[PDB]
Design a protein around this motif. Structure first.
Motif, short mmCIF file in Angstrom:
data_model
loop_
_atom_site.label_atom_id
_atom_site.label_comp_id
_atom_site.label_asym_id
_atom_site.label_seq_id
_atom_site.Cartn_x
_atom_site.Cartn_y
_atom_site.Cartn_z
N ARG A 171 -3.68 -6.78 29.32
CA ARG A 171 -5.08 -6.39 29.30
C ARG A 171 -5.83 -6.91 30.51
N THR A 201 1.09 -1.53 18.00
CA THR A 201 -0.15 -1.33 18.73
C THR A 201 0.15 -0.77 20.11
N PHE A 261 -1.16 10.58 21.68
CA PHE A 261 -1.68 9.32 22.19
C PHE A 261 -0.49 8.59 22.81
N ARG A 275 0.83 -1.19 0.00
CA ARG A 275 0.00 0.00 0.00
C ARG A 275 0.87 1.24 0.00
N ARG A 327 -1.28 0.63 23.82
CA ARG A 327 -2.38 0.49 24.76
C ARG A 327 -2.33 1.58 25.82
N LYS A 328 -3.50 2.02 26.24
CA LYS A 328 -3.60 3.06 27.25
C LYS A 328 -4.99 2.98 27.86
N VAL A 338 -8.00 1.69 25.77
CA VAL A 338 -8.02 2.02 24.35
C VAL A 338 -6.73 1.52 23.74
N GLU A 339 -6.86 0.72 22.68
CA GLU A 339 -5.72 0.29 21.89
C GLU A 339 -5.83 0.93 20.52
N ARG A 340 -4.71 1.41 20.00
CA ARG A 340 -4.69 2.17 18.76
C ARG A 340 -3.55 1.64 17.91
N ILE A 341 -3.87 1.21 16.69
CA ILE A 341 -2.91 0.55 15.81
C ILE A 341 -2.36 1.58 14.84
N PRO A 392 0.36 2.27 11.55
CA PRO A 392 1.40 1.89 10.59
C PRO A 392 2.68 2.65 10.88
N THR A 421 3.38 -2.50 11.62
CA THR A 421 2.45 -1.76 12.45
C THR A 421 2.72 -2.08 13.92
N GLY A 431 -5.28 4.25 7.47
CA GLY A 431 -4.61 2.99 7.71
C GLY A 431 -4.42 2.63 9.16
N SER A 432 -4.97 3.40 10.08
CA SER A 432 -4.85 3.08 11.49
C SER A 432 -6.08 2.29 11.92
N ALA A 433 -6.18 2.00 13.22
CA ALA A 433 -7.36 1.34 13.76
C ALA A 433 -7.43 1.67 15.25
N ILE A 434 -8.63 1.63 15.79
CA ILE A 434 -8.83 1.94 17.20
C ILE A 434 -9.64 0.81 17.82
N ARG A 435 -9.37 0.54 19.10
CA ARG A 435 -10.00 -0.56 19.81
C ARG A 435 -10.31 -0.11 21.22
N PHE A 436 -11.51 -0.43 21.69
CA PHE A 436 -11.89 -0.10 23.05
C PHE A 436 -12.08 -1.38 23.85
N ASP A 437 -12.03 -1.24 25.17
CA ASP A 437 -12.13 -2.39 26.06
C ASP A 437 -13.55 -2.91 26.21
N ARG A 476 2.67 -4.32 21.10
CA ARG A 476 2.87 -5.21 19.96
C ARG A 476 3.53 -4.46 18.81
#
Ligand SMILES: [Mg+2]
Ligand SMILES: [Mg+2]
Ligand SMILES: [Mg+2]
Ligand SMILES: [Mg+2]
Ligand SMILES: [Mg+2]
Ligand SMILES: [Mg+2]
Ligand SMILES: [Mg+2]
Ligand SMILES: [Mg+2]
Ligand SMILES: [Mg+2]
Ligand SMILES: [Mg+2]
Ligand SMILES: [Mg+2]
Ligand SMILES: [Mg+2]
Ligand SMILES: [Mg+2]
Ligand SMILES: [Mg+2]
Ligand SMILES: [Mg+2]
Ligand SMILES: [Mg+2]
Ligand SMILES: [Mg+2]
Ligand SMILES: [Mg+2]
Ligand SMILES: [Mg+2]
Ligand SMILES: [Mg+2]
Ligand SMILES: [Mg+2]
Ligand SMILES: [Mg+2]
Ligand SMILES: [Mg+2]
Ligand SMILES: [Mg+2]
Ligand SMILES: [Mg+2]
Ligand SMILES: [Mg+2]
Ligand SMILES: [Mg+2]
Ligand SMILES: [Mg+2]
Ligand SMILES: [Mg+2]
Ligand SMILES: [Mg+2]
Ligand SMILES: [Mg+2]
Ligand SMILES: [Mg+2]
Ligand SMILES: [Mg+2]
Ligand SMILES: [Mg+2]
Ligand SMILES: [Mg+2]
Ligand SMILES: [Mg+2]
Ligand SMILES: [Mg+2]
Ligand SMILES: [Mg+2]
Ligand SMILES: [Mg+2]
Ligand SMILES: [Mg+2]
Ligand SMILES: [Mg+2]
Ligand SMILES: [Mg+2]
Ligand SMILES: [Mg+2]
Ligand SMILES: [Mg+2]
Ligand SMILES: [Mg+2]
Ligand SMILES: [Mg+2]
Ligand SMILES: [Mg+2]
Ligand SMILES: [Mg+2]
Ligand SMILES: [Mg+2]
Ligand SMILES: [Mg+2]
Ligand SMILES: [Mg+2]
Ligand SMILES: [Mg+2]
Ligand SMILES: [Mg+2]
Ligand SMILES: [Mg+2]
Ligand SMILES: [Mg+2]
Ligand SMILES: [Mg+2]
Ligand SMILES: [Mg+2]
Ligand SMILES: [Mg+2]
Ligand SMILES: [Mg+2]
Ligand SMILES: [Mg+2]
Ligand SMILES: [Mg+2]
Ligand SMILES: [Mg+2]
Ligand SMILES: [Mg+2]
Ligand SMILES: [Mg+2]
Ligand SMILES: [Mg+2]
Ligand SMILES: [Mg+2]
Ligand SMILES: [Mg+2]
Ligand SMILES: [Mg+2]
Ligand SMILES: [Mg+2]
Ligand SMILES: [Mg+2]
Ligand SMILES: [Mg+2]
Ligand SMILES: [Mg+2]
Ligand SMILES: [Mg+2]
Ligand SMILES: [Mg+2]
Ligand SMILES: [Mg+2]
Ligand SMILES: [Mg+2]
Ligand SMILES: [Mg+2]
Ligand SMILES: [Mg+2]
Ligand SMILES: [Mg+2]
Ligand SMILES: [Mg+2]
Ligand SMILES: [Mg+2]
Ligand SMILES: [Mg+2]
Ligand SMILES: [Mg+2]
Ligand SMILES: [Mg+2]
Ligand SMILES: [Mg+2]
Ligand SMILES: [Mg+2]
Ligand SMILES: [Mg+2]
Ligand SMILES: [Mg+2]
Ligand SMILES: [Mg+2]
Ligand SMILES: [Mg+2]
Ligand SMILES: [Mg+2]
Ligand SMILES: [Mg+2]
Ligand SMILES: [Mg+2]
Ligand SMILES: [Mg+2]
Ligand SMILES: [Mg+2]
Ligand SMILES: [Mg+2]
Ligand SMILES: [Mg+2]
Ligand SMILES: [Mg+2]
Ligand SMILES: [Mg+2]
Ligand SMILES: [Mg+2]
Ligand SMILES: [Mg+2]
Ligand SMILES: [Mg+2]
Ligand SMILES: [Mg+2]
Ligand SMILES: [Mg+2]
Ligand SMILES: [Mg+2]
Ligand SMILES: [Mg+2]
Ligand SMILES: [Mg+2]
Ligand SMILES: [Mg+2]
Ligand SMILES: [Mg+2]
Ligand SMILES: [Mg+2]
Ligand SMILES: [Mg+2]
Ligand SMILES: [Mg+2]
Ligand SMILES: [Mg+2]
Ligand SMILES: [Mg+2]
Ligand SMILES: [Mg+2]
Ligand SMILES: [Mg+2]
Ligand SMILES: [Mg+2]
Ligand SMILES: [Mg+2]
Ligand SMILES: [Mg+2]
Ligand SMILES: [Mg+2]
Ligand SMILES: [Mg+2]
Ligand SMILES: [Mg+2]
Ligand SMILES: [Mg+2]
Ligand SMILES: [Mg+2]
Ligand SMILES: [Mg+2]
Ligand SMILES: [Mg+2]
Ligand SMILES: [Mg+2]
Ligand SMILES: [Mg+2]
Ligand SMILES: [Mg+2]
Ligand SMILES: [Mg+2]
Ligand SMILES: [Mg+2]
Ligand SMILES: [Mg+2]
Ligand SMILES: [Mg+2]
Ligand SMILES: [Mg+2]
Ligand SMILES: [Mg+2]
Ligand SMILES: [Mg+2]
Ligand SMILES: [Mg+2]
Ligand SMILES: [Mg+2]
Ligand SMILES: [Mg+2]
Ligand SMILES: [Mg+2]
Ligand SMILES: [Mg+2]
Ligand SMILES: [Mg+2]
Ligand SMILES: [Mg+2]
Ligand SMILES: [Mg+2]
Ligand SMILES: [Mg+2]
Ligand SMILES: [Mg+2]
Ligand SMILES: [Mg+2]
Ligand SMILES: [Mg+2]
Ligand SMILES: [Mg+2]
Ligand SMILES: [Mg+2]
Ligand SMILES: [Mg+2]
Ligand SMILES: [Mg+2]
Ligand SMILES: [Mg+2]
Ligand SMILES: [Mg+2]
Ligand SMILES: [Mg+2]
Ligand SMILES: [Mg+2]
Ligand SMILES: [Mg+2]
Ligand SMILES: [Mg+2]
Ligand SMILES: [Mg+2]
Ligand SMILES: [Mg+2]
Ligand SMILES: [Mg+2]
Ligand SMILES: [Mg+2]
Ligand SMILES: [Mg+2]
Ligand SMILES: [Mg+2]
Ligand SMILES: [Mg+2]
Ligand SMILES: [Mg+2]
Ligand SMILES: [Mg+2]
Ligand SMILES: [Mg+2]
Ligand SMILES: [Mg+2]
Ligand SMILES: [Mg+2]
Ligand SMILES: [Mg+2]
Ligand SMILES: [Mg+2]
Ligand SMILES: [Mg+2]
Ligand SMILES: [Mg+2]
Ligand SMILES: [Mg+2]
Ligand SMILES: [Mg+2]
Ligand SMILES: [Mg+2]
Ligand SMILES: [Mg+2]
Ligand SMILES: [Mg+2]
Ligand SMILES: [Mg+2]
Ligand SMILES: [Mg+2]
Ligand SMILES: [Mg+2]
Ligand SMILES: [Mg+2]
Ligand SMILES: [Mg+2]
Ligand SMILES: [Mg+2]
Ligand SMILES: [Mg+2]
Ligand SMILES: [Mg+2]
Ligand SMILES: [Mg+2]
Ligand SMILES: [Mg+2]
Ligand SMILES: [Mg+2]
Ligand SMILES: [Mg+2]
Ligand SMILES: [Mg+2]
Ligand SMILES: [Mg+2]
Ligand SMILES: [Mg+2]
Ligand SMILES: [Mg+2]
Ligand SMILES: [Mg+2]
Ligand SMILES: [Mg+2]
Ligand SMILES: [Mg+2]
Ligand SMILES: [Mg+2]
Ligand SMILES: [Mg+2]
Ligand SMILES: [Mg+2]
Ligand SMILES: [Mg+2]
Ligand SMILES: [Mg+2]
Ligand SMILES: [Mg+2]
Ligand SMILES: [Mg+2]
Ligand SMILES: [Mg+2]
Ligand SMILES: [Mg+2]
Ligand SMILES: [Mg+2]
Ligand SMILES: [Mg+2]
Ligand SMILES: [Mg+2]
Ligand SMILES: [Mg+2]
Ligand SMILES: [Mg+2]
Ligand SMILES: [Mg+2]
Ligand SMILES: [Mg+2]
Ligand SMILES: [Mg+2]
Ligand SMILES: [Mg+2]
Ligand SMILES: [Mg+2]
Ligand SMILES: [Mg+2]
Ligand SMILES: [Mg+2]
Ligand SMILES: [Mg+2]
Ligand SMILES: [Mg+2]
Ligand SMILES: [Mg+2]
Ligand SMILES: [Mg+2]
Ligand SMILES: [Mg+2]
Ligand SMILES: [Mg+2]
Ligand SMILES: [Mg+2]
Ligand SMILES: [Mg+2]
Ligand SMILES: [Mg+2]
Ligand SMILES: [Mg+2]
Ligand SMILES: [Mg+2]
Ligand SMILES: [Mg+2]
Ligand SMILES: [Mg+2]
Ligand SMILES: [Mg+2]
Ligand SMILES: [Zn+2]
Lengths: 71, 59, 204, 118, 5, 131, 122
Positions: free
Chosen positions: F103, F62, F45, C13, F64-65, F72-75, F77, F60, G74-80, F51
């Motif tokens: 976690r 990852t 952030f 990409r 965590r916070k 909240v985990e935010r991935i 690149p 990428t 291209g990012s991603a977000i995740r909540f608990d 990871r």
RNA sequence: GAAUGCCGGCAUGAGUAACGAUAAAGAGGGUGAGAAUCCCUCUCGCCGUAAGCCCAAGGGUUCCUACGCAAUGGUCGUCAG
RNA sequence: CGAUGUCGGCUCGUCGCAUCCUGGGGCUGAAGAAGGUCCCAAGGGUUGGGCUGUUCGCCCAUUAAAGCGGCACGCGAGCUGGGUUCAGAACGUCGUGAGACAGUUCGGUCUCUAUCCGCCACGGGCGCAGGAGGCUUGAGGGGGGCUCUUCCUAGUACGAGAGGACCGGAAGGGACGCACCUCUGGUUUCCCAGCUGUCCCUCCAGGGGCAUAAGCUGGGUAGCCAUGUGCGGAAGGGAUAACCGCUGAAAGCAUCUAAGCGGGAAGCCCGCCCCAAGAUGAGGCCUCCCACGGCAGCCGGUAAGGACCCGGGAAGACCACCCGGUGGAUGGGCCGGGGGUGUAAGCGCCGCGAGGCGUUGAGCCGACCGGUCCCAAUCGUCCGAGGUCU
């Protein structure tokens, strides 16, 4: 009979091959009120449709005789 | 299952029409350059023991 | 109706205007014109392109004559591009500018003998509640005595994949003429190293 | 599907297949040449080649690595002191596979010999 | 077995 | 052709080399360009890097916070142009490459598990001592 | 990825604690709800004297999901957890406070008052 | 010429299902006309309140040795109840 | 009746049209918006749940819609077996009784192997007047065909107001489909680490077996994948349905019609995608070989070529297909990179010790992108035209 719907369907319980495949059970709906009567007392859709209509009237009659009593 | 079974005897003509694909193909054989004996290609010759020009095993 | 032959390089990409863009990379050019089909001679119009250079020790005599009659060094792949008559006698990636839309044809990946679930997205069977050795099975394939047969084209198991597939209206993200690369936004049929065709789109 | 998968299965589970490769490595380094089936031979090549290469390295770690598969310090000593010296300047491919011509009577199995190289 | 009764 | 080298070639106009190296268990603050209805502000952030999955330019990481009660985990690149800068806030020492297990841990337990990576902290302090 | 039967925490002060999704209000047959999508839910757990009560059939917009949301950069977000703010038919929140972070997606989908009241937008 | 007739013989299904616990095999040496299948060696695996050992029932020479491989052994067989 | 397995469900569809939605219409007691009613239309679509064995029906929450029927009330050699439809038991009821019940209640064995047609896939043979290697035309098939919301036009036309368009133009979805693996997320049977018990090698240290057909645990490449990504439904041309006309008699008027011409549907033909010359009507083009020797035939040896055999392959059940065969990078090894794991052993130091620190992102390291003839694809064999007649 224009505000009455009549459903036919398979019955319940015993009867072997007959009860499996016969639309002997009848529902009758008074469409304005919604009150219904079901009947599968016999194996005949006709005798059951007759006994169900008779009961639907008798019940509607009592509802009509009762709102008058209140009045 | 309900135990499928042949409905009719297969005819002589039709069982043999089936075997029309059953013939063996004779084995591919090339001469061994060393001892001139016939052998399958790409194998050590079981007669003189040579392969790739040199001797590889006792026969 | 421009077209070119090409090989699938792989995916990656790029970032274009603060966005990720999933791209497949194609090595397209260069394609020597080997024969032109004309109406006076063949009944239709098309250009037979060549692609990938070939070891002349491998090209038998009927093919060597064909290549010679055109002045082309032996090529591995010959494919036509219907209704396309390029001016010059070499077709390269430069027929595509970024922003154009293309159709890309490839030989999809081969699933072999494929079950009815993988091939036809059938729901399969239950996995408990008494299901009996039918967990991936197709169920009924018919009616009863009428019609007493199974329709032609009835979806059943069998080979799936390794067939011609054209994905349509893909975007051209970039063209690197220095390396005969073509970037295309999206997915292209088949495996890395597979041979593909890139035509002008037929959508409007 | 099997796309781009390396490794035969030889109709064995994980621990039997490994043990099969190990016992064939033992026989091969022991006798220098063994006869087996063609598919087994082809798979023993790399499994044994790697072991010889670690012997070419000679270090204690390498020896302790080899002993995980071969387990026989005598045999490992034969590998480190006699076999491995022959290959100092050979760059891999210490093994060869040549197909035989006749098949096993009792099952028709195509055979081949596997041997160490000069 | 199942029956036509 | 060398198909891998072609891909590497395509990708190479986008590769960053301005970002500091960091490992799982490090605490990190990513400054990320974020469009807000109309304009573009930099929203930070900060959190533990749980990871890093590596695939060259397609790497990428990852982060965590816990934020106002919720994890909240935010991935991210790793070569994104949406990243202004990354600041190393702490060097933590893990024993695995993927810290998903934090976690399910308390704050106390995570502190016990990812102690300060003294070694890479002295590396980070012995650096910048280049004037 | 929220569907019927899915339980969601309630990130407002309506008095609702847990709503259980019973419909994804997205077209004729959407399978899942993500951030910014409205669902219908019944209130499974609440606290005394709140506006909503155990058993009401309310609406709500999903603000936090446990399945990661993907984004064009291209990012991603995740909540608990899975969280939702209970709203009215005009899509406005019914409580007066939003607890915890919310997805920035809610902005681009018309939920400014929710985005406003939230302590952090990620 | 028929009795889902009786006795026998031979077909079809078919080179098909199967070859009886998924505890597991590999190599080298020997023997022999013939060896994945017998003997020996090394390696590997399995049972170990047994898949080891000893009694009683039942069975009745199956025990040991030499010579054998037509048939029996679900393959093979130089081996064997 | 020397057996045509019976409800409902599941799965898989296919057809009808008396059409539930979407498209096109006429009338309206049609202002607009929204309806009613009838006509055309079967291309596509036609949700998830609570109750009950149910069919049916009611209800909840949605929707453009939640259509009705046929196919042995489609489909049990496809599954289920809750109900029906044996033997047990009990209740109510009837019978002096044995027992009985379109009454109820709890329970109650559903048969590995497909011969033929048919269907899905894949080959072998022969044919397609010379033999060959390629590239193709597309007769004829098949696939696909859904739809909503918001915004602009425009708060305009219409309407006292509330409410609120036609036409035209943007954007964003749901479901379905085809492909793909960059990302997100899985798996990843030995790719790495950690851990217990036990036995072992070799005493320590280091290891190996077994605890599953991975002992357990934490991770995990490629591949295969959806929950992830791309893209599809068209556009457009043509002919039409209901319907609306133009010009126009018969019938001085009138008439869409009798002569003629136009407009007009998600439907029809073409267009798109895929198959396809066994299309025996066996097509076309480019290139190659070539009148060999022996009495439309036979026999030999060759031609261009082909096959065998081998190394292999995101091709594959076998077959086929594709690539390679020393003039070679085809697989195996070896090397470099990627990737995983996460700092090996050994040693030195600190601690009484469990351990810790350093050497060290170390060591190990499937498949991924490549290089390298180190190992193997040795050496070869067979088949294969001389073209009939008008
Ligand atoms: Mg009626
Ligand atoms: Mg009935
Ligand atoms: Mg009942
Ligand atoms: Mg009865
Ligand atoms: Mg009847
Ligand atoms: Mg059956
Ligand atoms: Mg069955
Ligand atoms: Mg069964
Ligand atoms: Mg059977
Ligand atoms: Mg018969
Ligand atoms: Mg038969
Ligand atoms: Mg016969
Ligand atoms: Mg016969
Ligand atoms: Mg036959
Ligand atoms: Mg015969
Ligand atoms: Mg056969
Ligand atoms: Mg023969
Ligand atoms: Mg660009
Ligand atoms: Mg391809
Ligand atoms: Mg393919
Ligand atoms: Mg394949
Ligand atoms: Mg599929
Ligand atoms: Mg599927
Ligand atoms: Mg299903
Ligand atoms: Mg289902
Ligand atoms: Mg399933
Ligand atoms: Mg199951
Ligand atoms: Mg059963
Ligand atoms: Mg079955
Ligand atoms: Mg099962
Ligand atoms: Mg299946
Ligand atoms: Mg089935
Ligand atoms: Mg039948
Ligand atoms: Mg039936
Ligand atoms: Mg018929
Ligand atoms: Mg195929
Ligand atoms: Mg587009
Ligand atoms: Mg290039
Ligand atoms: Mg192609
Ligand atoms: Mg190629
Ligand atoms: Mg498969
Ligand atoms: Mg498999
Ligand atoms: Mg491979
Ligand atoms: Mg392996
Ligand atoms: Mg097996
Ligand atoms: Mg096996
Ligand atoms: Mg087997
Ligand atoms: Mg095991
Ligand atoms: Mg040995
Ligand atoms: Mg010897
Ligand atoms: Mg042997
Ligand atoms: Mg073997
Ligand atoms: Mg040493
Ligand atoms: Mg050989
Ligand atoms: Mg052979
Ligand atoms: Mg045998
Ligand atoms: Mg034998
Ligand atoms: Mg790559
Ligand atoms: Mg913290
Ligand atoms: Mg710890
Ligand atoms: Mg610690
Ligand atoms: Mg440290
Ligand atoms: Mg709460
Ligand atoms: Mg309350
Ligand atoms: Mg309650
Ligand atoms: Mg309550
Ligand atoms: Mg609220
Ligand atoms: Mg909260
Ligand atoms: Mg007679
Ligand atoms: Mg008789
Ligand atoms: Mg008889
Ligand atoms: Mg006799
Ligand atoms: Mg007899
Ligand atoms: Mg007889
Ligand atoms: Mg006989
Ligand atoms: Mg027979
Ligand atoms: Mg017989
Ligand atoms: Mg026979
Ligand atoms: Mg066979
Ligand atoms: Mg058969
Ligand atoms: Mg079979
Ligand atoms: Mg059998
Ligand atoms: Mg078998
Ligand atoms: Mg058996
Ligand atoms: Mg067995
Ligand atoms: Mg067992
Ligand atoms: Mg088992
Ligand atoms: Mg066992
Ligand atoms: Mg076995
Ligand atoms: Mg061995
Ligand atoms: Mg053996
Ligand atoms: Mg042996
Ligand atoms: Mg032996
Ligand atoms: Mg033997
Ligand atoms: Mg023998
Ligand atoms: Mg023995
Ligand atoms: Mg014990
Ligand atoms: Mg006795
Ligand atoms: Mg006896
Ligand atoms: Mg005896
Ligand atoms: Mg015998
Ligand atoms: Mg004999
Ligand atoms: Mg014998
Ligand atoms: Mg005798
Ligand atoms: Mg026998
Ligand atoms: Mg025998
Ligand atoms: Mg037996
Ligand atoms: Mg003998
Ligand atoms: Mg004995
Ligand atoms: Mg009958
Ligand atoms: Mg009979
Ligand atoms: Mg009969
Ligand atoms: Mg019968
Ligand atoms: Mg019958
Ligand atoms: Mg009609
Ligand atoms: Mg309509
Ligand atoms: Mg309409
Ligand atoms: Mg109307
Ligand atoms: Mg109106
Ligand atoms: Mg009408
Ligand atoms: Mg339709
Ligand atoms: Mg239900
Ligand atoms: Mg319930
Ligand atoms: Mg129901
Ligand atoms: Mg009912
Ligand atoms: Mg509507
Ligand atoms: Mg409605
Ligand atoms: Mg429903
Ligand atoms: Mg139907
Ligand atoms: Mg039926
Ligand atoms: Mg039905
Ligand atoms: Mg049925
Ligand atoms: Mg059937
Ligand atoms: Mg059944
Ligand atoms: Mg049924
Ligand atoms: Mg049947
Ligand atoms: Mg059947
Ligand atoms: Mg049948
Ligand atoms: Mg039952
Ligand atoms: Mg049952
Ligand atoms: Mg009976
Ligand atoms: Mg009583
Ligand atoms: Mg009496
Ligand atoms: Mg009594
Ligand atoms: Mg009485
Ligand atoms: Mg009674
Ligand atoms: Mg009863
Ligand atoms: Mg009744
Ligand atoms: Mg009952
Ligand atoms: Mg009862
Ligand atoms: Mg029971
Ligand atoms: Mg019952
Ligand atoms: Mg069975
Ligand atoms: Mg058959
Ligand atoms: Mg037939
Ligand atoms: Mg057939
Ligand atoms: Mg053929
Ligand atoms: Mg000819
Ligand atoms: Mg050809
Ligand atoms: Mg074509
Ligand atoms: Mg056509
Ligand atoms: Mg035809
Ligand atoms: Mg068509
Ligand atoms: Mg359509
Ligand atoms: Mg306006
Ligand atoms: Mg206006
Ligand atoms: Mg207004
Ligand atoms: Mg509009
Ligand atoms: Mg469809
Ligand atoms: Mg396709
Ligand atoms: Mg698909
Ligand atoms: Mg793919
Ligand atoms: Mg796929
Ligand atoms: Mg992935
Ligand atoms: Mg990948
Ligand atoms: Mg993957
Ligand atoms: Mg992943
Ligand atoms: Mg390993
Ligand atoms: Mg120890
Ligand atoms: Mg151990
Ligand atoms: Mg042991
Ligand atoms: Mg054991
Ligand atoms: Mg075991
Ligand atoms: Mg267990
Ligand atoms: Mg292990
Ligand atoms: Mg794991
Ligand atoms: Mg994982
Ligand atoms: Mg993977
Ligand atoms: Mg992965
Ligand atoms: Mg895939
Ligand atoms: Mg998906
Ligand atoms: Mg006139
Ligand atoms: Mg007029
Ligand atoms: Mg006319
Ligand atoms: Mg017209
Ligand atoms: Mg007009
Ligand atoms: Mg028209
Ligand atoms: Mg459309
Ligand atoms: Mg084609
Ligand atoms: Mg042809
Ligand atoms: Mg063709
Ligand atoms: Mg003919
Ligand atoms: Mg002809
Ligand atoms: Mg014809
Ligand atoms: Mg002809
Ligand atoms: Mg032709
Ligand atoms: Mg033609
Ligand atoms: Mg061929
Ligand atoms: Mg193969
Ligand atoms: Mg094959
Ligand atoms: Mg094969
Ligand atoms: Mg070839
Ligand atoms: Mg050759
Ligand atoms: Mg050759
Ligand atoms: Mg190679
Ligand atoms: Mg290589
Ligand atoms: Mg190459
Ligand atoms: Mg291989
Ligand atoms: Mg790395
Ligand atoms: Mg350390
Ligand atoms: Mg160390
Ligand atoms: Mg140590
Ligand atoms: Mg140490
Ligand atoms: Mg000390
Ligand atoms: Mg530590
Ligand atoms: Mg590394
Ligand atoms: Mg290792
Ligand atoms: Mg290495
Ligand atoms: Mg490496
Ligand atoms: Mg390796
Ligand atoms: Mg890749
Ligand atoms: Mg070279
Ligand atoms: Mg030769
Ligand atoms: Zn020879």
């Amino acid at each position: 009979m224009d505000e009455i719907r009549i459903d036919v369907m398979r019955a319940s319980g015993p009867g072997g091959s007959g009860v499996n495949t016969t639309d002997s059970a009848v529902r009758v709906v008074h469409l304005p009120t919604g009150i219904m009567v079901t009947c599968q007392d016999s194996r005949s859709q006709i005798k059951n449709r007759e006994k169900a209509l008779m009961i639907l009237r008798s019940r509607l009659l009592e509802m009509k005789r009762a709102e008058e009593a209140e009045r | 299952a309900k135990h499928p079974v042949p409905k009719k005897k297969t005819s002589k003509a039709r069982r043999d029409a089936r075997r029309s694909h059953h013939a063996l193909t004779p084995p591919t054989l090339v001469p061994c350059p060393e001892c001139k004996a016939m052998k399958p290609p790409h194998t050590v010759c079981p007669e003189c023991g040579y392969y790739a020009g040199r001797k590889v095993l006792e026969v | 109706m421009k077209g070119i032959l090409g090989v699938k390089v792989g995916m990656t990409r790029i970032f274009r205007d603060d966005r990720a863009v999933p791209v497949t990379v194609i090595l397209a050019g260069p394609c020597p014109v080997v024969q032109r089909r004309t109406p006076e001679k063949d009944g239709y119009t098309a250009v037979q392109l060549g692609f990938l250079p070939q070891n002349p020790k491998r090209v038998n005599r009927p093919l060597k004559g064909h290549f010679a009659k055109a002045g082309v060094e032996p090529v591995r792949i010959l494919r036509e591009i219907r209704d396309f008559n390029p001016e010059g006698d070499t077709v390269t990636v430069e027929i595509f500018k970024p922003g154009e839309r293309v159709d890309v044809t490839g030989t999809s990946k081969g699933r072999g003998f494929a079950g009815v679930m993988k091939r036809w997205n059938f729901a399969g069977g239950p996995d408990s509640h008494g299901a009996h050795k039918i967990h991936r099975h197709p169920g009924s394939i018919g009616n009863r005595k009428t019609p007493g047969r199974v329709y032609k084209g009835k979806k059943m198991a069998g080979h799936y994949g390794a067939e011609r597939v054209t994905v349509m209206n893909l975007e051209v993200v970039d063209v690197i003429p220095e390396e005969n690369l073509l970037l295309v936004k999206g997915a292209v049929p088949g495996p890395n190293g597979g041979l593909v065709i890139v035509r002008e789109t037929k959508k409007a | 599907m099997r796309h781009l998968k390396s490794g035969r299965k030889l109709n064995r589970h994980s621990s039997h297949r490994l043990a099969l490769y190990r016992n064939q490595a033992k026989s091969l380094l022991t006798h220098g040449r063994i006869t087996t089936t063609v598919p087994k031979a082809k798979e023993l090549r790399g499994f044994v080649d790697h072991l010889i290469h670690l012997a070419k390295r000679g270090d204690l770690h390498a020896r302790r690595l080899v002993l995980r598969d071969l387990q026989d310090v005598k045999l490992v000593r034969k590998l480190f002191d006699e076999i491995a010296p022959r290959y100092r300047d050979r760059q891999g491919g210490y093994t060869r596979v040549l197909k035989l011509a006749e098949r096993r009577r009792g099952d028709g199995a195509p055979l081949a010999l596997v041997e160490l190289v000069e | 077995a199942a029956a036509k009764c | 052709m060398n198909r891998g080298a072609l891909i590497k070639l395509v990708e190479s106009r986008y590769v960053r080399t301005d970002l500091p190296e960091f490992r799982p268990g490090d605490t990190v603050r990513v400054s990320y360009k974020v469009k807000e209805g109309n304009r573009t502000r930099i929203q930070d952030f900060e959190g533990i890097v749980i990871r890093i999955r590596r695939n060259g330019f397609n790497t990428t990481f990852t982060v965590r916070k816990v934020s106002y009660g919720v994890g909240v985990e935010r991935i991210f690149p790793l070569h994104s142009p949406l990243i202004q800068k990354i600041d190393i806030v702490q060097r933590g020492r893990a024993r695995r490459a993927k810290l998903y297990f934090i976690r399910n841990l308390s704050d106390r337990e995570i502190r016990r598990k990812l102690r300060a990576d003294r070694k890479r902290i002295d590396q980070d302090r012995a650096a910048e001592r280049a004037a | 990825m929220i569907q019927p039967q899915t339980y969601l925490e309630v990130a407002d002060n309506t008095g609702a604690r847990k709503i259980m999704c019973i419909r994804v209000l997205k077209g004729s047959n959407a399978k899942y709800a993500t951030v910014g999508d409205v669902i219908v839910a019944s209130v499974k757990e609440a606290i005394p004297r709140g506006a909503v009560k155990e058993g009401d059939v309310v609406k709500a917009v999903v603000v936090r999901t446990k399945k990661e949301i993907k984004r064009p950069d291209g990012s991603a977000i995740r909540f608990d957890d899975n969280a939702a703010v209970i709203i009215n038919n005009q899509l406005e929140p019914r409580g007066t406070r939003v607890f915890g972070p919310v997805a920035r997606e809610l902005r681009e989908k018309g939920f400014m008052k929710i985005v406003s009241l939230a302590p952090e937008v990620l």
